[PDB]
Design a protein around this ligand. Sequence first.
Ligand SMILES: CC/C=C/C/C=C\C/C=C/C/C=C/C/C=C\C/C=C\CCC(=O)O
Ligand SMILES: CC/C=C/C/C=C\C/C=C/C/C=C/C/C=C\C/C=C\CCC(=O)O
Lengths: 214, 214, 11, 11
Amino acid sequence: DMPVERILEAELAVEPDPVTNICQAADKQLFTLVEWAKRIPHFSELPLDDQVILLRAGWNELLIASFSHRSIAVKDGILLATGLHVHRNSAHSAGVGAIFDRVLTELVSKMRDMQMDKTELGCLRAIVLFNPDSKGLSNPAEVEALREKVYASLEAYCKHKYPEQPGRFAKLLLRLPALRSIGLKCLEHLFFFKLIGDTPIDTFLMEMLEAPHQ
Amino acid sequence: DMPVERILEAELAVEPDPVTNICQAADKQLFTLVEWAKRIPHFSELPLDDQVILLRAGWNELLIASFSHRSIAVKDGILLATGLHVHRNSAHSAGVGAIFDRVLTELVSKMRDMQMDKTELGCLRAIVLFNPDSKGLSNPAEVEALREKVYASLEAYCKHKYPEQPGRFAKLLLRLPALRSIGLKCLEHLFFFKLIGDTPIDTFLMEMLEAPHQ
Amino acid sequence: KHKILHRLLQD
Amino acid sequence: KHKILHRLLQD
Ligand SMILES: CC/C=C/C/C=C\C/C=C/C/C=C/C/C=C\C/C=C\CCC(=O)O
Ligand SMILES: CC/C=C/C/C=C\C/C=C/C/C=C/C/C=C\C/C=C\CCC(=O)O
């Protein structure tokens, strides 16, 4: 029903001022995010309004998980989807050093140390996508059901591919609180960049900063 | 090494304007939180500075997990440690309805629906306490080790006490991202109450709002 | 509503 | 530093 093979395929099919470049890349990746979500089992079957809600609720965490994992072999930096490497010194010199360091310390380095693979990344992102707590969902139980199927498949995968690591499944899930926190902080930064006026923000990224409709 | 029995004992030993009453109760529970942490295996063995860091980093989530679980049998409301029941209508009439509803929907109701027990609550709180991502930690690996022991014991407990529910362990861990988000939002509210000047904030709660020391 | 996202999901 | 918390943990 929720084959990790499909999730892995979704990841593989999507594979490609520092702040301005990061925002530029974020807008670009939002289009790709939609294509990725469509490839995730059963997502496109959900009603259109729920698909919108899930993507608007999880895009920032989804994009952060992606560039963090893409940056595993990068030292003290991150690799943007545009091919540009952004080093810690550059982020610090732009005034966003603290949040950049959290990404490196809480996400990139942890993914690197445990050698999180693309299948695991995919499943974690699918879990984030299928967030049953997203407000407005026409049928939260259905999304919750999908989430449960994803983590059931993920745990099965972990136990099979890494039998010598009994805590790997829990380890993967325990990076989600950090991802949630970092995602919220990155969003605050984005809103401030918008507020200041400087830093160009493209249409898709800008649309994500729009208010819902109550 | 990390017996769930000890964790359960810690929970049991600690057992006892809407905003003003909530803040009042929060200050009161902070003292109790320290006593609880001391009863959690190996916490008191960590260096004093790390104990401080862990408690300053997790107190809000720790307190939220506690009152949420205490409120399971409460309908559309929460039970404060002072014995006072705070209903949704009251929170809404005080201007904090949105965050109150998130607590009820994402935490209280979920805990109720799955019948999360005190041992599970205890383990989840212990995992939150032993947060290896807390900045300044003299030895993050040690805290991470403790966290791993807690969730290993928790999963063993779940599999034994609820063999018919194979996804229960993951279900419990997946409430942590919501807890992190809600904790951050509650903190923002507290800072605003402090900023406004109205709403009395007692010394311990106030100390938690103090800046660290870089 | 959210113009761009709807158009992309619809396609 | 954080006076109250230190005093409580010390005890
Ligand atoms: C990298 C985040 C921390 C640095 C501070 C500046 C960025 C704040 C921007 C906030 C928007 C939310 C972040 C989520 C994803 C987009 C940014 C990252 C890279 C773009 C996508 C890519 O290249 O893979
Ligand atoms: C209950 C939170 C939502 C309502 C809005 C008002 C509260 C904001 C206060 C923020 C402080 C952080 C919250 C964590 C814990 C303390 C508040 C809850 C109850 C006090 C402890 C208790 O009675 O068990």
